[PDB]
Amino acid sequence: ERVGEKDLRAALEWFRSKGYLVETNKEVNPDLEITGLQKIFDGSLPMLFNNVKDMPHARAITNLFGDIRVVEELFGWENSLDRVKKVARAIDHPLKPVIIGQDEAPVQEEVLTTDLDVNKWLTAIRHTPLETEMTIGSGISCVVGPYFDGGSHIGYNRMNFRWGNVGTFQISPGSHMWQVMTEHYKDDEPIPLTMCFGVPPSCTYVAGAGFDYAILPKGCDEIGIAGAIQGSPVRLVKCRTIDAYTLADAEYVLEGYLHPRDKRYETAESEAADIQGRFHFHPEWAGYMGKAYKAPTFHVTAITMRRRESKPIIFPLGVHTADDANIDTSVRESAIFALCERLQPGIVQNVHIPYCMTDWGGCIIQVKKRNQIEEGWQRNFLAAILACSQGMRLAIAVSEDVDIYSMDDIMWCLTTRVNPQTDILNPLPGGRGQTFMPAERMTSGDKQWTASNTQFEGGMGIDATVPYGYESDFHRPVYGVDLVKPENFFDAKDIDKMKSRMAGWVLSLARTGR
Amino acid sequence: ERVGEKDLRAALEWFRSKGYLVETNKEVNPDLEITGLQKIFDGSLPMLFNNVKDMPHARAITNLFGDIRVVEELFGWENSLDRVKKVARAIDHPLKPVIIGQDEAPVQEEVLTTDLDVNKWLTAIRHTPLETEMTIGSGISCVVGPYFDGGSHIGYNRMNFRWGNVGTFQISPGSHMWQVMTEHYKDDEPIPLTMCFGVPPSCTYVAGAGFDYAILPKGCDEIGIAGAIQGSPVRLVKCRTIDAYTLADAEYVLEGYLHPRDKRYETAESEAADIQGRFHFHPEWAGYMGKAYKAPTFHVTAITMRRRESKPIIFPLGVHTADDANIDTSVRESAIFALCERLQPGIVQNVHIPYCMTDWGGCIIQVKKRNQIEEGWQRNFLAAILACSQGMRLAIAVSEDVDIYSMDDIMWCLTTRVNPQTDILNPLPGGRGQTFMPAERMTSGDKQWTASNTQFEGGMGIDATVPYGYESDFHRPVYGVDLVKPENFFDAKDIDKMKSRMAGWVLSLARTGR
C-alpha cells in the first residue's frame, strides 16, 4: 500500500521534473500566511510547504491549479479549446472505477478509530484577518453507490470542526449533496460519506464541477469522468467502519455520517445570536466576504491516512484565487459546451468562463452561424445556459472573430454589437439563484439573507453576435502585421524594448492584426 | 523662423533624451508598412522613420501617443487620475494664444502658392490591403476667429486629394466643423480654414477631443486648452493667402477654403456607382472597416511648410491603434469628469475610457457615495453622459473599490453588481447616434447607411455601483498580501519565476489583495 499510480505525489514528481515546482522548508502558519502567499502569487506555479505550523506530520501544497497552462500540460492538452473538447468527450465516455483491497490502498496505512480530533491531524486555515474560525476547506465529498443511484459524486464541502469529531458541512442548495440530502431527509439512518484529502488532480478537477445537471445529473459517474480525464480508472477501497467507498490514492480520509436534521451554526458569533447570513465566514466564490449559516453536521467515525512518517500532503486553497476558479470553471466550461452541442451541433465553437466573471455567475460562448437557418440559435443557447445553471447571472454570446480569452475584446463586443432593446435577455425572473451573490441580498430585504428569502432577478443573456448576412458591415479591420518584418527596420534591442511595454489588449490585437 | 519652443521637434529631442525614441534609417513604404509596423507594436514607444518611400523631403513619426505613460511623462503628470484632473483644470482655465509675425513662424519658411499637388508633399498612407485610395489622415483643422465665434477649434479631418489641389473633407455630423458648416451652409463665400501637420503634441492632444460640447461648446478656445496643457501659449501666425490663422510651430500647413455645398465622393468606386456607406474606406474608430461617403471639398490655395532640407515631420497613424485611442479619449475623459463635477461635486472619483470600449462609444465613471442623500446621483451622471455625448453606446458606473483600468474588474462588477431589471438605463431611444457603428446600420434597413437614415437604440447606462448602506454585504475580500513577505520563504529565483507567469487580473488582484 505505497503506490498510487496517478495521484498527488506523482503529480508533484512531474512538476519537479518540469521545473514548475516551488518548494520551501520554512515553517508557515496556516493562520494568514498560506492564503496570503497564494494571493501574492495568484495564478502561478505550485507552492509546496514542507513544514506547517503545529502540523509536524503534514505538508501543504497550494496554487496547484493556479496556472491553467501547467494543468493542461499535466493532463496532456495543447490549449484550452482542446481541453474543453476533450473533457466534453470524457464526460460522454466515463471509465468505471476499480475497487482494490483494503491492504493495497495507501490511504489506509494508518487507521485511527479513537481519539478523533480532526483539527489535530487536518490543517485548518484562516484566509483573512476578519475571520474568527479556522476552517477545513481542503476535502472533497465522496458518495458512491446506493445513495447516488449507483453512480458517484465528488465535490468540495467546507467544514468547521468545533465539536471535536463533529463539524458543520456546508451544502449548496441544488447540488448533488443537496439532492442526496433532500431524498434522505426524512430518514432515521444518517447518510454515510467520506471526505477525501490530497486526492489525485483529476478528482480535484471533476470535484470542481457544479450546477451542470443537464449534462451531469444525479446518478452520473463523476469519478468515472475523473478516470476518463486521467486516462486510467480511479481506484476505490471499502471503508473500515462505514458502508461506503473512498478514493484509495488519497492522503487523508475522514469516514463518518451526515446528519441532515442536526443543523448547527458555523461560527461562534452567529451561534451566539442566532442569525444566518450576517457574520463573516471566509471569502466566497462571488468575490465577497462570505457569511455564516446553519449547516448539517458530519459525525466523523474514523480518520484514515497515509503514514505520518511519509508526511501526507493536504491542499488548502483560498477561495478568491485563480486556483479555485480554474478548479470549478474548467469542467463547467466543458459541460456548457456539451449542452450547446446537444441542442444543435456545430454552432458553438468555444466556451470560456474567465476568472473575472465568477465560479457560478457567468460564461462566454462563441458561436458561428453557417447559414440563415442558424440565425437565432445563440438566443436558445443563452436561455438554455441560464436556465440549466441555477443562478448564472450573465451569459454572453459572441461571434467567431473575437478573442474569447480577452475581456477587453468582450467589452468591445458589448460596446459595438449589442442592441440594448433587443439583445438583452432576462429569461427567468423569479427563478432559483445563488444566495452567495449580495445582489440577491438586495432582494431579500429585511428578512434573513438565506436561500429561502432571496428573489432572483432573472439573469442577463447578452447576444453580442453579428447578425447573419451582415458580416461585411461588421468586418474586423485586419492590418498588415505579417506583410512587414520589424527585423528589417530595427535591431533586436529596439524590438524587445518596444515589446516589453505592450500588455493586454494590444498583445491580443498585435497577434491577430485587428 | 527656426525655433518652435514647444513643438514636435523638441518632443522628439526629449524622447531621445529619455531613451523612448526608436529611430530607423531604412526606406519605409506608406503603402501597408507604416500602419502595419504601428499595429505590430501597438501601444508602445514612438517610431521615427527618416526615409519615406517617394517622399525624399519628409520624415514620419508614429506611435507618438501610443504609450500613455510616456505621454504623461511628457506633459508632467504622475498617473492617469492626475492627468484627468489637471486637464479638467486646464479646460476651465485656458491660456490665450499669442500671434507672432510672418517671419518668425517656422511653418512659413517655404510658401508654395503654385504647383499645388498635395499628394506630392504630404504623405498619404494606406492602412489595409482592402483599400484602393491612399488618403491623408495626418492633419488637424484650425478655425480661429469669426467663424468660431471668437474662439478656436482644432480637430482631425481625413482628406483624399484626388483632384490635385481639391480633396474631400470628412466632417462628423454634430462636431464643431459641422456646426460651423451648418451655420455657413447657405453662404456664397466659402469657409477659410487651414490644415496643420506635425503640430505640437498639446495641439494633437486637444484635437482628439470631440462630442463634449456641454464642456467645450462652440466658441470655446481649444488652442487655449492646448496652451494650458503645455503650460505656455501656442503661437499663431496670419496666413499668406486666406484670412485665417495657423499654428506657427507646425511642420506643414495647407491653406484654402471649404466649400460645403460642393460635395464629392471619397473613393472612385463609390463615385462609380453613387452609393454612400458601402465601399471600403480605411478602418474606423468603432473597430470596423470604414465606408466611403460624400464629403465637402477643401480647395487648397497655398502649401506652406518648413525647409525641405530640414525634413519636416508628418504624423501618420492608423485608426484602430492605441495611439488614436489615447488621442481622443484622454481629453474626452477629462471633459466627462468636468461635467460630472459640475452637476454634483465630490462624487465622481475617476473617469476612464479604455481602448477596448471605443473612441466615442463608451466610458467608465467611478463614484463614491458619502451619505444616503447622494444615492442615485450615478444615474443622473449616466443619463447626462449618454445625453451629452451624441451616440455613446455604453456608460458604466462602478464603485470605489474597483480597479477602473482593468476590464476584468469591470466584468466582475457587471456579473455581481447589476440588477438586470433596474440597473440598465436606456435613456434616449431615437436620439442622435454615430453612423460609424454598424449596430446603427442594422437600424437603417435597406435604406442608405448614412446619418440621415440610422435610428439610435438609445445607449446603455449600467449602474454597477454598490447601494449605500450595503457596503458590508458588498465588501471586497482583502487578503493578507502585506502581512507575509515572500522573501523569507523563497529565494529570488523562485520569486521572479512565479512572478513571470502572472498576467492581467491576477496582477491587479495580487497589488490590492482582493
Ligand SMILES: CC(C)(COP(=O)(O)OP(=O)(O)OC[C@H]1O[C@@H](n2cnc3c(N)ncnc32)[C@H](O)[C@@H]1OP(=O)(O)O)[C@@H](O)C(=O)NCCC(=O)NCCSC(=O)c1ccccc1
Ligand atoms: C439554504 C439553507 C440551508 C436553508 O436553511 P434555513 O433558511 O435556515 O431554514 P431551515 O434550515 O430551518 O429549513 C427550512 C425547512 O424546510 C425543510 N427543509 C430544509 N431543507 C430541506 C431539504 N434539503 N429537504 C427537505 N426538506 C428540507 C425542513 O423541514 C426545514 O424545516 P425543519 O428544519 O425541519 O424545522 C440556509 O441555511 C442557507 O442559506 N445556506 C447557505 C446557502 C448556500 O448558498 N451555500 C453555498 C455553499 S457553496 C460555496 O461555498 C462555494 C462555491 C464555489 C466555490 C467556493 C465556495
Ligand SMILES: CC(C)(COP(=O)(O)OP(=O)(O)OC[C@H]1O[C@@H](n2cnc3c(N)ncnc32)[C@H](O)[C@@H]1OP(=O)(O)O)[C@@H](O)C(=O)NCCC(=O)NCCSC(=O)c1ccccc1
Ligand atoms: C451625414 C452626411 C454628410 C449626410 O449626407 P446625405 O445623407 O448623402 O444627404 P445630403 O448630402 O444630400 O444632404 C441632405 C440635405 O440636407 C441639407 N444639409 C445637409 N447638410 C447640411 C448642413 N450641415 N447644414 C444645413 N443643411 C444641410 C442640405 O440641404 C442637403 O440637401 P442638398 O445637399 O442641398 O441637396 C453623409 O454623407 C454621411 O453619412 N457622412 C458620414 C457621417 C459620419 O459619421 N462621419 C464620421 C467621421 S469621424 C471618424 O472618421 C473618426 C472619428 C474618430 C477617430 C477616427 C475616425
Ligand SMILES: [Ca+2]
Ligand atoms: Ca476558467
Ligand SMILES: [Ca+2]
Ligand atoms: Ca483613454
Ligand SMILES: [Fe+3]
Ligand atoms: Fe457531484
Ligand SMILES: [Fe+3]
Ligand atoms: Fe447582437
Ligand SMILES: [Fe+3]
Ligand atoms: Fe473643436
Ligand SMILES: [Fe+3]
Ligand atoms: Fe447596482
Ligand SMILES: [K+]
Ligand atoms: K463536482
Ligand SMILES: [K+]
Ligand atoms: K477637438
